Design a protein around this ligand. Structure first.
Ligand code: AMQ
Ligand code: ZN
Ligand code: ZN
Length: 258
């Protein structure tokens, strides 16, 4: 019947259409993941309903209750059948949900307000004047928390006990902080987002240095779900036909402003 697709409000993946308040259902949203959801549904041949995840989080297991939140939690506890969003494929998640092969490749990167004297992770680690942070409850924070690499262990030790907190609830909050910090706050987010922001007015931020790692985003389904196989082949098909590239051009560069 109708599949529940959990996703998250994160531009340019999923955003409200200009006149969304006068709309209903899937028509309220637009973006890369909305188009991707549409393309996959066509191949897997299913009817679906997009649902912005309640807590607005990507997904992490609370060390306390051991309960999964975010979109990951929606799949784990059976409140959603599929998740189409910029959800990073990681080991801890692979253990509780299934991931299609990646539909996009990326890595953790550094975002600075233009003019900031920072060109690498090493630069951030060896100073204290400029504060930095990452999104809360996601793969990026876990990367730093788990790294055995000196430079990253150093950054984690600083972010872990920063006051006030340097962990934001959304990508937008991180970006806003970078913009109003007048160069005193750098943000650590995936290259896809960093690249998108650089191309959006007021064009006051930029990605510096190369990525810190290499990974990908995958369409996720509950562990053992029957949709896993069809969805994975659909992702590969769309990759082969260059549809995924068309969509990146559409939502990133066709709409550039800098
Ligand atoms: C998007 C995005 O951009 N930077 C990030 O850390 C994220 C969230 C990350 N893709 C996750 O799945 O947790
Ligand atoms: Zn609105
Ligand atoms: Zn297609």
């Amino acid at each position: 019947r109708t599949i529940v697709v959990t996703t998250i409000l994160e531009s340019p993946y999923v955003m409200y259409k200009k006149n969304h308040e006068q709309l209903e259902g899937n028509e309220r949203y637009e973006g890369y993941c909305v188009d991707l959801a549409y393309e996959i549904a066509k191949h897997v041949r299913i009817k679906y309903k997009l649902s912005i995840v309640g807590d607005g989080k990507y997904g992490a297991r609370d060390p306390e209750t051991k309960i999964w939140n975010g979109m990951v939690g929606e799949l784990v506890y059976g409140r959603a059948d599929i998740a189409v969003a910029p959800l990073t494929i990681t080991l801890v998640r692979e253990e509780v949900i299934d991931f299609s092969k990646p539909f996009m490749s990326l890595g953790i990167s550094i975002m600075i307000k233009k003019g900031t004297p920072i060109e690498s992770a090493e630069d951030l680690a060896k100073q204290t004047e400029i504060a930095y942070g990452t999104l809360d409850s996601g793969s990026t924070k876990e990367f730093f928390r788990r790294s055995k690499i000196a430079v990253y262990e150093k950054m984690w030790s600083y972010m872990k006990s920063a006051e006030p907190s340097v962990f934001t609830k959304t990508t937008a909050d991180g970006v806003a902080r970078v913009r109003k910090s007048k160069g005193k706050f750098a943000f650590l987010l995936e290259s896809t987002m960093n690249e998108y922001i650089e191309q959006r007015k007021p064009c006051d931020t930029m990605k510096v240095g190369g990525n810190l790692d290499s990974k990908g985003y995958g369409v996720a389904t509950p562990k053992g779900s029957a949709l896993g196989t069809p969805v994975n082949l659909a992702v590969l098909k769309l990759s082969e036909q260059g549809i995924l590239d068309k969509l990146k051009n559409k939502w990133w560069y066709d709409k550039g402003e800098c």
